[PDB]
């Protein structure tokens, strides 16, 4: 109640602490990269259109608002 | 490929079928006029020369047949 309530537990505290390795960090990072390559696409397409029916693309300080 | 492949085409599709007007139609009707009006010579001409071995023409049911 006060030994093997807590003793027994003070192992199995650890022995299950020790052995739970989920995973790593920064591989959220990674996925920065394929959010931004997956934009590249979208932009650039997303941009022919207006390249399209104005014929032509938006200046810099009309930026990307323009679309 | 779905879009820039398309989109892009269908503008192209319009843009080129609405500006191409070839012509009108009725025109051969005016040439049957000169193709009849051509066998007016070409007819009493050629009737002539029998109205000229046998001295004149033939015959409503003998027909330009007998030419």
């Given at each position: 109640?006060?030994?093997?309530?807590?003793?027994?537990?003070?192992?199995?505290?650890?022995?299950?602490?020790?052995?739970?390795?989920?995973?790593?960090?920064?591989?959220?990072?990674?996925?920065?990269?394929q959010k931004v390559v997956s934009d590249l696409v979208a932009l650039e397409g997303a941009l022919d259109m207006y390249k399209l029916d104005n014929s032509r693309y938006p200046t810099t300080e009309q930026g990307l608002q323009a679309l």
């Amino acid at each position: 109640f006060t030994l093997l309530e807590i003793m027994v537990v003070i192992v199995i505290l650890g022995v299950l602490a020790s052995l739970v390795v989920p995973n790593l960090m920064g591989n959220k990072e990674k996925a920065d990269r394929q959010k931004v390559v997956s934009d590249l696409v979208a932009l650039e397409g997303a941009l022919d259109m207006y390249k399209l029916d104005n014929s032509r693309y938006p200046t810099t300080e009309q930026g990307l608002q323009a679309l």
